Write an enzyme that holds these catalytic residues in place. Sequence first.
Site, PDB file in Angstrom:
ATOM      1  N   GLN A  49     -33.015 -19.376  -4.893  1.00 21.97           N
ATOM      2  CA  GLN A  49     -33.061 -18.057  -4.484  1.00 21.97           C
ATOM      3  C   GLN A  49     -32.816 -17.045  -5.625  1.00 21.97           C
ATOM      4  O   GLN A  49     -33.145 -15.741  -5.341  1.00 21.97           O
ATOM      5  CB  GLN A  49     -31.852 -17.906  -3.705  1.00 21.97           C
TER       6      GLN A  49
ATOM      7  N   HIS B 116     -21.659 -17.799   2.048  1.00 22.25           N
ATOM      8  CA  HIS B 116     -22.817 -18.341   1.546  1.00 22.25           C
ATOM      9  C   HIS B 116     -23.232 -19.719   2.188  1.00 22.25           C
ATOM     10  O   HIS B 116     -22.311 -20.219   2.619  1.00 22.25           O
ATOM     11  CB  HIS B 116     -22.469 -18.737   0.017  1.00 22.25           C
TER      12      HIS B 116
ATOM     13  N   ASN C 107     -28.183 -26.871  -1.639  1.00 24.93           N
ATOM     14  CA  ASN C 107     -27.934 -25.436  -2.036  1.00 24.93           C
ATOM     15  C   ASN C 107     -29.279 -25.074  -2.232  1.00 24.93           C
ATOM     16  O   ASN C 107     -30.351 -25.798  -2.581  1.00 24.93           O
ATOM     17  CB  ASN C 107     -27.020 -25.594  -3.015  1.00 24.93           C
TER      18      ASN C 107
ATOM     19  N   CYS D 135     -29.486 -16.907   0.702  1.00 25.65           N
ATOM     20  CA  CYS D 135     -29.034 -18.103   1.455  1.00 25.65           C
ATOM     21  C   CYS D 135     -29.201 -18.437   2.615  1.00 25.65           C
ATOM     22  O   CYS D 135     -29.548 -19.563   3.050  1.00 25.65           O
ATOM     23  CB  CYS D 135     -27.401 -18.107   0.747  1.00 25.65           C
TER      24      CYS D 135
END
Lengths: 215, 215
Positions: free
Chosen positions: A19, A162, A182, A25
Amino acid sequence: VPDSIDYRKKGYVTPVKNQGQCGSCWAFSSAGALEGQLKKKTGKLLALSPQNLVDCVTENYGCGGGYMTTAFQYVQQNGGIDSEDAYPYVGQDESCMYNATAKAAKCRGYREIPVGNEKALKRAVARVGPISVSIDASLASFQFYSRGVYYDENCDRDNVNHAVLVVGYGTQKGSKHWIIKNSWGESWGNKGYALLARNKNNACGITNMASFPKM
Amino acid sequence: VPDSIDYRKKGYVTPVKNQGQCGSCWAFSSAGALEGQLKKKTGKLLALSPQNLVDCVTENYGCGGGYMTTAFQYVQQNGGIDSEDAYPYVGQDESCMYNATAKAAKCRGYREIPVGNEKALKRAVARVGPISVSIDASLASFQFYSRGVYYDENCDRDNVNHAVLVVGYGTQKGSKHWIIKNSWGESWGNKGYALLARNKNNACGITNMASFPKM
Ligand SMILES: *[C@@H]1O[C@H](CO[C@@H]2O[C@@H](C)[C@@H](O)[C@@H](O)[C@@H]2O)[C@@H](O[C@@H]2O[C@H](CO)[C@@H](O[C@@H]3O[C@H](CO[C@H]4O[C@H](CO)[C@@H](O[C@H]5O[C@H](CO)[C@@H](O[C@@H]6O[C@H](CO)[C@H](O)[C@H](O)[C@H]6O)[C@H](O)[C@@H]5O)[C@H](O)[C@@H]4O)[C@@H](O)[C@H](O[C@H]4O[C@H](CO)[C@@H](O)[C@H](O)[C@@H]4O)[C@@H]3O)[C@H](O)[C@H]2NC(C)=O)[C@H](O)[C@H]1NC(C)=O
Ligand SMILES: *[C@@H]1O[C@H](CO)[C@@H](O)[C@H](O)[C@H]1NC(C)=O
């Protein structure tokens, strides 16, 4: 309700992305849960566009944060979401450049996980597929994670900041865990994934704000 | 339930193809209905493979005939069907070249329309989408059709012999009708399509054997 599942093994997860300096996110988790469900309904795994959501979910703040539940509702009400190939990620805010013909998936709504019920999330990952979740990613120990079953007693069980994507669960060296994707590139963690403490009193608030799309 | 629907208008139908001297009408009808449902669930229109079914539906007779319902059941138990691009049509029998990575759609079973109940089929077209059906296409008046609402009182209501895909219904010059996609190329009929008499006592056995896949 199996003891162990890893939706990477089963062809349900797209490659880890990065990102960058955009705070998007929430869009990678959404597209990730929708990738899984598109794979379940179809046979094809196709990376969908977080940029689509970053630009177009007006009730979110673009690169400055957002929610998965409202992302799902956008794709539902918008009646579609474009593919990453059609709408590649550029990591910066802009106008909704959505193109309704490059549409690659749809949404019939969403369901939320009961807050604070890890036993529930375990079944949901197994039954539904990869589940969008929200965590406390604020500690230094989580940003620089590389190996093992993450557990920090200072991780805030009460507040999250997040978005990630739970893609399985299981046990390593006798420590039960969640498997997470992630959006920090493959350089982070274990090829971009991690293992978080599971059935240890909602470590880092994993079920505080979890949802998945209906298709 | 609408008075008129035309899934051509809505992007649910791929271009007319030509089955040639192979007797695989059933496979174009199947794939056409699967194309329709893939568009409804995901939003993308992607031409799927009749050759996949011709080669691999063992309980059918390949180029020597078959059923849509048994085609659907294959895609369910096979867990997928390839795209026309991955598995192009050759109008001849050959070995099952199925490739599970080229999976483009899946099937959770099928449902049949009540036999002889055009009012029911009307609901299915409106609710579900394009419905695979079988008709009597053996007469010269159908082979040489070009325009208008086809109606021959000699059309066999009791023994159908050729598969088509109902892609809508409506009314033209006060004659209620079905909209069908044939597999005889664009030279036949009205750019490969026709309009069959509707609510005129199950003309050509349109509802004698109609089904669609579940997804
Ligand atoms: C069964 O079907 C399979 C799928 O069919 C395809 O899908 C649909 C669209 C069909 O309609 C077909 O048209 C398609 O072919 C067939 O598998 C395909 O087969 C092709 C031929 O064997 C393969 O292409 C050849 O390989 C490369 C191109 O590489 C591609 O790879 C992927 C495919 O999705 C993607 O790019 C990624 O590649 C890696 C995938 O693992 C990925 O790796 C990651 O890397 C990270 C770090 O970098 C990390 O560590 C991860 O852990 C790691 O996995 C990469 O990073 C990329 O992200 C692209 O699409 C890419 O295009 C290429 O070298 C070949 O080119 C040759 O061509 C000419 C000769 O004419 C010449 O230039 C050279 O000689 C050159 O070598 C060629 O394109 C294709 O990859 C493959 N796809 C898949 C998904 O398997 C299969 O063949 C069928 N089998 C049968 C029996 O029918
Ligand atoms: C939308 O995407 C398609 C390609 O899938 C393209 O042909 C079309 O021109 C695009 N529409 C725009 C740029 O307005």
